[PDB]
Design a protein around this nucleic acid. Structure first.
Ligand SMILES: [Mg+2]
Ligand SMILES: [Mg+2]
Length: 342
DNA sequence: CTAGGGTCCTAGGACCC
DNA sequence: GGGTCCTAGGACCCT
């Protein structure tokens, strides 16, 4: 009763696309991200930039101090979306059991596959080879009996490689696996887990489920399970978008409602155009706004509302501006919509 | 020196039974 | 007091 799960993951995705489309970028350090003047961050970087320590989510000013010749690119999201659609279609040639997790990656359940003599290892390799043909981009892959181990595995032999974890290999792999590598255990949780002496799955295996449940709730059950290789989550090909949002951080903080209003007027057409692609009649479940202050606290306020409406967003932003700004400056303004249920 | 696109979980009061 | 909706906030995911 053992499933075969593939996780496919594109290498340096946004950067790989820019280098394909402009070979002059192949061997110099490059990164997609907002300039330091726009208070931006790195979305991702190629391997020459990563050599300098440039990483995703690094403030761009830090990236540039580490790597002064970093070439900064704004991003071509239709180019990325197009490569995303193309790899998903490549995935469909092998199975319909496809759960995309972002533009550049997906789980595949190939348990019931007839391709490559039922070998999940060869399926993954054929998929990666096919993606290199056809798109001139490379991908890595992970093969395992459950989702999270497959997703961990695709990072281990990257770029342009794969890694297989058999059931026989699961207990050795788990024993020294850092908790922070489990998707969904982030910096905050890893630091709480570290501070009680829990660093690895082998550490958590020596723990009581009842204690984990008291101290972490449902998360403690996930921790307990994952540390044993337990991950019964099914590959689900039927997930749907639940929200759409548009926000911008300005180059300088704002302090006047007129400035905030001016920003919303430019945000709103963009929110409308994006909603309309998925919901032509603009019918929605909720809409709302987001401010982030110069002390980096953030507030959202949103409400039931039947259809995208600019004036109500302005009104709501006005209340938020007056009712919970407390005189600090504002670095981000955002608009947001919750989609209807079906 | 701290983005923008999102998902999921938690938690209190409202409301309904 | 138990479901469920409403709303806010936050950890976390991807590049
Ligand atoms: Mg990737
Ligand atoms: Mg990815």
């Amino acid at each position: 009763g053992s499933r075969k799960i593939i996780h496919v993951d594109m290498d340096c995705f946004f950067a790989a696309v820019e280098m394909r489309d402009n070979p002059a970028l192949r061997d110099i350090p490059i990164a997609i991200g907002g300039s330091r003047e726009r208070r931006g961050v790195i979305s991702t970087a190629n391997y020459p930039a990563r050599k300098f320590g440039v990483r995703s989510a690094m403030p761009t000013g830090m990236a540039l101090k580490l790597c002064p010749h970093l070439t900064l690119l704004p991003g071509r999201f239709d180019a990325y979306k197009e490569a995303s659609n193309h790899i998903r279609e490549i995935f469909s040639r092998y199975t319909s059991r496809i759960e995309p997790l972002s533009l550049d990656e997906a789980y595949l359940d190939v348990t019931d596959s007839v391709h490559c003599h039922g070998s999940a290892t060869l399926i993954a390799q054929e998929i990666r080879q096919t993606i290199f043909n056809e798109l001139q981009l490379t991908a890595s892959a992970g093969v395992a009996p459950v989702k999270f181990l497959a997703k961990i595995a695709s990072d281990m032999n990257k770029p342009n490689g794969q890694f297989v974890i058999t059931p026989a290999e699961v207990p050795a792999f788990l024993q020294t696996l850092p908790l922070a590598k489990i998707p969904g255990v982030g910096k905050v949780s890893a630091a709480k887990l570290e501070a009680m002496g829990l660093r690895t799955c082998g550490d958590v295996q020596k723990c009581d489920l009842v204690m984990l449940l008291k101290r972490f709730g449902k998360f403690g059950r996930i921790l307990w399970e994952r540390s044993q290789g337990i991950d019964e989550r099914d590959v689900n090909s039927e997930r749907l978008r639940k929200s759409v949002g548009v926000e911008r951080t300005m180059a300088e903080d704002i302090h006047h409602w007129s400035e905030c209003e001016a920003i919303i007027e430019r945000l709103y057409p963009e929110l409308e155009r994006r909603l309309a692609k998925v919901k032509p009649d603009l019918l929605i479940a909720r809409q709302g706004v987001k401010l982030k202050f110069d002390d980096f606290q953030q507030t959202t306020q949103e409400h039931v509302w039947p259809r995208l409406n600019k004036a109500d967003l302005i009104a709501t932003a006005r209340k938020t501006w007056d009712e919970r700004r407390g005189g600090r400056g504002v670095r981000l303004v955002g608009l947001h919509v919750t989609l209807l249920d079906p």
